[PDB]
Amino acid sequence: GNSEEDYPNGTWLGDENNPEMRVRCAIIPSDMLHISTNCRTAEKMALTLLDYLFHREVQAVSNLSGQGKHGKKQLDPLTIYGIRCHLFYKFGITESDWYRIKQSIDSKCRTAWRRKQ
Ligand SMILES: [Br-]
Ligand SMILES: [Cl-]
Ligand SMILES: [Cl-]
């Protein structure tokens, strides 16, 4: 989401006060606060956000780059940037951290695909 109207009942990933580090999403306010306090590492928060933001059927046919053996859709890039910003504001992730978090997201998408077979 670039705007509040995209998800009127949702939340901002990142910080609403920063136009360059915010992405509107479908997660409701109380659920976002639950994720904040229950997901105690950046990796756990990333993977939990992924399950709130992308249906498992979408995860099964997607990955970050949109590449695979018979094609994969890219996970929505603006939403992924929103995850990055959200993790930065909560945990202070570095570039190295983010690369690894991306590896964990891609592994989760591969697991979603395997579970369907
Ligand atoms: Br990004
Ligand atoms: Cl809150
Ligand atoms: Cl778990």
Author numbering: 207 to 323
Paper text:
pmcThe BEN (BANP, E5R, and NAC1) domain is a ∼100-residue protein domain found in metazoans and viruses, but missing in nematodes and urochordates. The BEN domain-containing transcription factors regulate transcription by recruiting chromatin-modifying factors to specific chromatin regions via their DNA-binding BEN domains.
We then carried out crystallization experiments and solved the structures of the BANP BEN domain in the apo form and in complex with the palindromic DNA by using the short and long constructs of the human BEN domain (aa 208-324 and aa 208-347), respectively. Structural analysis showed that the BEN domain of BANP mainly consisted of a short N-terminal β-hairpin, which was packed against a helix-bundle core of 5 α-helices. In the BANP-DNA complex structure, the extra C-terminal region after the helix α5 in the longer construct is disordered and unresolved in the structure. The structures of the BANP BEN domain in the apo form and the DNA complex overlaid very well with an RMSD of 0.68 Å over its 101 Cα atoms, suggesting that the DNA binding did not cause significant conformational changes. BANP also mediates the suppression of apoptotic genes BAX and PUMA through binding to their MARs elements during mild DNA damage, leading to cell cycle arrest. These findings suggest that BANP could bind to diverse DNA motifs, acting as either a transcription activator or a transcription repressor.
